[PDB]
From a paper:
CypA is of special interest, since it is a well characterized dynamic enzyme where minor active-site side-chain conformations, absent in cryogenic electron-density maps, help explain the catalytic function of the enzyme, which isomerizes its substrate via correlated motions of the side chains. At 100 K, damage was concentrated mainly on cysteines, me­thio­nines, aspartates, glutamates and main-chain carboxyl O atoms. We confirmed that, despite the faster decay of crystals at room temperature, many sites where damage is concentrated at 100 K do not appear affected to the same extent at room temperature.
Crystals of these proteins diffract to high resolution, which makes it possible to fit alternate conformations. Here, the conformational ensembles of three proteins subjected to increasing doses of radiation were examined for signs of damage at 100 K and 278 K. We found that crystal structures respond differently to increasing dose at these temperatures. At both temperatures the conformational heterogeneity (in terms of the number of alternative conformations) of the crystal structures is at most minimally affected by dose.
Numbering used by the authors: 2 to 165
The structure:
Amino acid sequence: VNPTVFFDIAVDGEPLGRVSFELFADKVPKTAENFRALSTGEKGFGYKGSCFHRIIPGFMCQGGDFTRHNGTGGKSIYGEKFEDENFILKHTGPGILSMANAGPNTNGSQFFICTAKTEWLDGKHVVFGKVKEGMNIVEAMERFGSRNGKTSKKITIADCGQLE
């Protein structure tokens, strides 16, 4: 019953591949629903065409700022940054999908995909999904990041939506 969504990734406009995610609506419904709705674009805005603006190899790939494209923007589907739903799920290794934020109860649209275990983030960032297929595509993306997070090529969500 948990929804599956996909991102089709491009690198400087060239197709790279598809990453799919299981979203844990059973455990974090409000947080899963935000991401799913942003991924389909059914509210009139969302992830399609946005970039991964911060990528640090061995740590994580961050995206979801579809409004300012640099980590200063993004918005939820709810009309105003939302609460940390719960911290049931932990940052237990590569593939974990988690909400970026600006402190307690400030969730918008930005997220990260872990490429390692990042337990120091437990209790600070709401984990709400996990890569189901295409972790190799995330690994290929990661190689275009750098120590300070700046990417050396433009990493884009060329298309996205819900699978079934």
